[PDB]
Amino acid sequence: PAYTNSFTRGVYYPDKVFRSSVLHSTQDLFLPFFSNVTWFHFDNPVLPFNDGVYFASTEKSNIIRGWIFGTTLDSKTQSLLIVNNATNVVIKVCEFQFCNDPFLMESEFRVYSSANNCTFEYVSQPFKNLREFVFKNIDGYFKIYSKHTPINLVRDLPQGFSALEPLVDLPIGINITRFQTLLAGAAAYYVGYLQPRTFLLKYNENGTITDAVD
Amino acid sequence: CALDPLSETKCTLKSFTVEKGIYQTSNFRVQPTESIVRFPNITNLCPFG
Amino acid sequence: LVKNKCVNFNFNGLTGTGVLTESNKKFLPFQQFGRDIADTTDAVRDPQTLEILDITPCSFGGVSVITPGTNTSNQVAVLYQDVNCTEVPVAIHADQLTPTWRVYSTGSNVFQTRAGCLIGAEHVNNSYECDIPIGAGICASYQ
Amino acid sequence: FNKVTLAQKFNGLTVLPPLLTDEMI
Amino acid sequence: QKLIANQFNSAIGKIQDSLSSTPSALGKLQDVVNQNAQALNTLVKQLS
Ligand SMILES: *[C@@H]1O[C@H](CO)[C@@H](O)[C@H](O)[C@H]1NC(C)=O
Ligand SMILES: *[C@@H]1O[C@H](CO)[C@@H](O)[C@H](O)[C@H]1NC(C)=O
Ligand SMILES: *[C@@H]1O[C@H](CO)[C@@H](O)[C@H](O)[C@H]1NC(C)=O
Ligand SMILES: *[C@@H]1O[C@H](CO)[C@@H](O)[C@H](O)[C@H]1NC(C)=O
């Protein structure tokens, strides 16, 4: 229940090419306009990736941070671990002993102690928090898009348009098939899915995407 | 065929005489001078000190 | 670095020849270079000084020879089409070309029109019915 | 002239100006 | 004579308003311009 439809949300910049006052027709992985998004009201099961995942949430205070992503839940693929605490985000990709009753004085470090044999800890540090992260992880590159925008009331998903400029690129070299986010009084976060679609974007004279049509 | 502009016109027209007018003979193009291969600064260095 | 001179560059694998003039378009922090319609590279940001440099094509165009005939006279004039030739003969390397072409490729009589530039013909202040149509309202004659 | 309004030059494509300028017309 | 002169002047006056207030009166020339532009744009696009 309480499913929500998106008023043209989840449009990012496909590339770093700068264009002015042009109408470009592109074909990439986007979130369709007026589509179903799954809203969770606490319960955080494992959700499949399925060639890209969208994520928008309302974050008054830092509550939902751990974006721990796995691949196969087996003994072959290494599960990456993007733990972001307020002081400094750390992106460390290496396998660890899964807790038989998984969870997560604020930060408890009892999750693991065997940090050995996991080299290249490449920490690539780069109501307002409408944390509209698109977690596109395709072709070996982890691309993270974000935007912080304010609203009049924290009531529902806003209207209008908001471009999603890229923020972080990571040469992880692995892929993610199933991801589960673990929390640290209802935390409202939405999860959408990306599928190949054709879009027609419009650039203003400044270079920012103003409007688009599916 | 490469001595005088009038000789170029005679070559192009394939005739020893030409009539009053304007004829398009050849094309010209400015060639590059040097190479300016440039890369950004190196912000990462091995800690050799 | 070179400015206002035709040069082929290489910016992180972006290969092309042109003139690296100063530009005024404002980029975005995540954007690397720019493009226009028909997908041609237009502006490239400076990787070091963080400046945007516009790219323009190197000069090129056709060459036409204006002649009144052969039985009349052997004097001809040369028109370089849609190129600003007030600057070509000095910057470029004309060593390979023989001086025979150099004599008629320069001089004190260089006329800049809206159809290009005219070398070898003088500009008069009297208007007659014109014989050889050059372009943009300019004609030539043997007087 | 105001009601109807109209450039690039690449890959060896050129546009030649007309002989009769609009003032002459 | 006066009636004919007045009628001609009124028609000449209304011609400007009729031409300016119709957005498709001069579409016989913009068609040519657009066709030439589209042809040239298509030719260049074939280089890729
Ligand atoms: C989401 O799915 C429900 C259940 O079928 C449907 O009633 C609702 O209109 C959908 N809204 C969207 C497009 O998000
Ligand atoms: C968490 O915050 C501490 C603050 O001292 C910082 O040192 C650390 O790098 C941060 N990252 C994690 C998750 O430990
Ligand atoms: C050619 O360029 C020079 C340098 O800007 C300028 O002074 C001159 O007027 C130009 N000639 C024309 C009209 O093509
Ligand atoms: C006459 O020709 C000269 C030289 O081309 C030009 O400078 C001048 O403006 C013309 N007309 C006059 C006398 O003003």
Helix/strand/coil (H/E/C) assignment for every residue in E15-35: HHHHHHCCCCCCHHHHHHHHH
Q: How far apart are CA C21 and CA A8, in angstroms?
A: 40
CB neighbourhood size of A181 (10 A): 20
- Give CA–CA dist A165/A23, Å, rounded: 18
C-alpha span between A39 and A191 (Å, rounded): 7
Structure-token pair, residue C121: 């013909």
Resolution in A: 3.3
Separation of alpha carbons A176 and A52, rounded Å: 9
Which residue's CA lies nearest to atom 11 of ligand 4? C125
**Pairwise CA distance, residues B39 & C10, whole Å:** 9
Question: Measured in angstroms, how far is the CA atom of residue A209 from the centroid of ligand 1?
Answer: 28
Question: By the 8 A CB rule, do A13 and A209 touch?
Answer: yes
Cβ-Cβ contacts under 8 Å for C132 (sequence gap 6 or more): B20, B21, B22, C66, C68, C139, C140, C141
- Residue C24's identity, in one-letter code, is N
Separation between Cα atoms, residue A168 and residue A145, nearest integer Å: 7
C66 inside 8 A of chain B by CB: yes
To 5 degrees, how large is the angle CA C2–CA C6–CA C8?
Answer: 85
Is A128:A57 a contact under the CB 8 Å cutoff? no
CA dist A199 and A33 (Å) reads 10
Nearest chain A CA: its distance from C136 CA (Å):
32
Look up residue A149 and give its amino acid: T
C-alpha distances in angstroms, C85 versus B15, C112, C136, E13?
Answer: 30, 8, 17, 49
| Structural element, H or E, at residue B12 | helix B5-13
Ramachandran assignment for C73, one of left (phi > 0), alpha (psi -120 to 50 degrees), beta (any other): beta
Question: Does residue A20 have its Cβ closer than 6 Å to ligand 2?
Answer: no
In the chain, the amino acid numbered B39 is F
Distance CA A30, CA A14 (A): 10
C8 exposure class (CB count in 10 Å sphere: 0-12, 13-18, 19+): middle
HSE-CB at A25 with a 13 A cutoff on CA atoms is 2
DSSP calls for C21-68: EE------TT--EEE-TTS-EEEEE-TTT--EEEEEPPPEEEEEEEE-
Three-state SS at A72:
coil
- For chain A, breaks with the C atom over 2.5 A from the next N come after 41, 104, 126, 184
B39 exposed, middle or buried (CB, 10 Å; 0-12, 13-18, 19+)?
exposed
Which pair of structure tokens corresponds to residue E31?
A: 């068609």
Element (H, E) at C119: strand C116-119
Q: Is residue C119 a contact partner of residue C107, using CB atoms and an 8 Å limit?
A: yes
Contacts of C130 (CB under 8 A, 6+ apart): C139, C140, C141
The CATH code of domain A2-214 reads 2.60.120.960
Q: Indicate which ligand has the atom closest to the C-alpha of C125.
A: 4
Q: Is A1 in the pocket of ligand 1 (CB under 6 A)?
A: no
* Ligand 3 surroundings by CB, under 6 angstroms: C 84, 86, 112
Solved using: cryo-EM
